[PDB]
Design a protein around this ligand. Structure first.
Ligand SMILES: [Mg+2]
Ligand SMILES: [Mg+2]
Lengths: 261, 261, 261, 261, 4
């Protein structure tokens, strides 16, 4: 990508304070896009906004993507300051692994609403602006669980696969409207949250954290975790005008764990 | 298949009064399975039960698969009469095509609950019986909308793709527990509901119903609609013990419209 | 199948003397099809023919499927005795696992000619007869290596994927000609050929053959090898007239190792 | 020049004088890679080399990729001038559409050798250099015919699917060796080669070339042909170190015609 | 949540 590629394009990213969302925001900022970063907590969001102001005009907003009323108000405030959103990156996730019979109606609904319902409601709010402008990019951060199954992750796989279905059908519906709809499907990514789970099980099984990291990296044929910057690289690539022919695709960022076709 | 293959196997089929569900019930009845047929209306359900009693012991139960309390009671009554369910065929569907922006929260939720949530709740209720027996078959009737996108059918594609995700993850979870979990994905099938829509468009465009049937059959490379019996043939094939190696699969019954891999 | 049995249908099966091919021939013989069994050696072929004559009219023919002149003559002799071939099961395979740089031009060509070229030439020879009759079934026995990659099996994966490509394009070309073209993709199957591949990789990775057998069965989520009868069950299912809507599909028989969609 | 990403990386591109190959060479030249451009004809290759010397050090070599002896010598000459090849883009293609029965052994072999065999031999020649350097990129330009079937293009689909199988297996084999192997699958692209295919099908189906061009653009949901720049954009994206996690993937560049997963 |  060029240094002044997405200049004058308002991009909104959810789950932006840390991990994958933070790296996506950083890659879009280095490309010149004006950013709206959405996160659940005030801590880490304001620090990310201050850091990314060195490259572009950045803004932060706190809100729960599951709450429709909170998002309807948040979207209005963000579009009032930086205009309509041209690039939307849906990066909200939730996974609680358990045997299928131990998943009650409430936990089933939470997986569906966070991983699929939130993206539906945000697209519904920002799509009129994209249609009015005649150009747009909707990028859904799904997972390898949206392309393949995992035991003990039935609700997560069902919701993430549903996000690929939403991606594919909407890509065809908006094909001749100047908007592309794509999904990026990362495998296990090296985030501060993952490093805490590695350190937790290492402290509980009397093992070194490096030995525990091997268990997480085992599914990746490259023998390592995916870096958040590698997920972000796939996102920024799609925002270019030369990526207009990329539509309805699920790009796996998992070292070969899932090989799409 | 053999004429006395599924003798002594209790099979429960939803959406059994007409179309695909009726053909599935007929094929399972000719194979010798004891049937519990679930449908929303009393009318065609009792007629189907009376017709299928010529081949096997049949039972009819009326209930809304979206209501959990109604299904919890229905399952208890059916298992009291014919014992635990060994074969579950989830065939509940709902589709209302519209532009994405014209899909309110209520309509979005209805697509998710009928096409995905109902299968989750019925599997949750009948899986303990299958685990106790050490053998079972969970067959989810999805659609080609679970494998590819269609414009103006975003919620239907999202829910049907979610049913493939549920299928895949649960197939891995139950792989060494004697149960196979598979999805059958029909394309446009020649049902009384579809024939009403073809006759409606023929009477609105001054065309013969045969010319309108060409538009519906256009996506099928074979130039015809899928027959309900062809969907049923794929269901009964999976119930055999020789189909134990078929697990986590999505079988498209669409003449080549979707070519799986 | 009893109501729509294969009586009066000439079926030709390659690699028929042992393993998957023998189980396919047995299933087709019990269904009433007249069989032409092709194999490289005379030894187990004539024993299989004598055993299967209890169910149907069987014929044995020896030949190398890689040699075009030998197959052109063999086909002529078989069609002279039992008329044109209605069902063709391409079950010729060859795999020699090695690092990519240790695969010379000769060995690369052998993988392409046995696993893909042989199916092309046999379809070219028998397709005019199927078109004349207005009905036919072409069933290509590929592998999970036709749907996913495996290290140290690059030429085998390339040739087996090519067979899926042949399957898909020809299914669309013959969609309205009464013929279905499908592929069955088994995982590791319990055969004498598998035992040779186990001993080969054990001698190359400094491991015991029992550890290699367990490693291959570990790829199958069901914790066991696929039975040849399970592959045969998927073949005979496709030959029914009720399986006319199954076209251009790749059916994985691998317990969930590969989940198609 | 500002984009200094692939500076000091020797990239070899086949089919580089015109169309997709020319756009790939242009994108790699603007990124700072030293280029070896291979084409069958001296015409247009020398002119492309002279034009691209404004951005980077370029070299032109004429040779038939089907001939192994000619390629073995060509590779030696190119590596003598610019050192070992770090990026290999296999963009050799050949398609002659016809009914399956009108494809003789010679024409079948030409499709296999040009679309699949040439990539195998070039990877075999350049992979030792990539392993020695500890870094590499193998990018196979396949097609939507490598992911789905097309009537009247059976040999092209078989060879292009085989190139995806080569891509997948080799990606796993080289996963921990610093090299990624991926395939880019364009749909109908606006090139001089496409105009020849349009004129060929028009002369064979008694239709005007304008009607054939519209029929091919109708398969693309975006209602237009893919631009060569769009295919090139997907190639250069993969060459970055931030695309190291993209391995064993097939990226469709077809507006949503094929939706990978 | 710092704006601007
Ligand atoms: Mg597909
Ligand atoms: Mg897959």
């Amino acid at each position: 990508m060029d240094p002044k590629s997405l200049v004058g394009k308002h991009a909104l990213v959810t789950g932006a304070s840390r991990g994958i969302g933070a790296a996506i925001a950083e890659a879009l900022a280095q490309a010149g896009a004006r950013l709206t970063l959405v996160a659940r907590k005030l801590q880490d969001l304001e620090e990310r906004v201050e850091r990314l102001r060195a490259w572009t005009e950045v803004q932060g907003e706190v809100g729960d993507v599951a709450d429709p009323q909170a998002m309807e108000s948040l979207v209005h405030r963000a579009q009032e300051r930086f205009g309509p959103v041209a690039i939307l990156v849906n990066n909200a996730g939730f996974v609680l692994t358990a045997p299928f019979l131990e998943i009650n109606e409430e936990l089933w609904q939470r997986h569906i609403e966070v991983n699929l319902g939130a993206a539906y409601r945000l697209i519904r709010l920002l799509l009129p602006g994209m249609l009015e402008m005649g150009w747009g990019r909707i990028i859904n951060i799904s997972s390898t669980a949206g392309l393949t199954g995992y035991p003990y992750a039935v609700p997560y796989c069902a919701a993430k696969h549903g996000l690929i279905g939403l991606t594919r059908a909407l890509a065809l519906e908006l094909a001749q409207r100047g908007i592309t709809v794509n999904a990026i499907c990362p495998g296990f990514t090296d985030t501060d949250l993952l490093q805490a789970s590695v350190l937790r099980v290492a402290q509980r099984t009397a093992r070194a954290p490096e030995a525990v990291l091997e268990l997480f990296a085992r599914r990746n044929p490259q023998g390592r975790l995916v870096r958040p910057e590698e997920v972000a690289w796939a996102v920024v690539w799609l925002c270019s005008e030369k990526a207009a022919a990329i539509n309805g695709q699920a790009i796996a960022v998992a070292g070969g764990e899932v090989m799409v076709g």
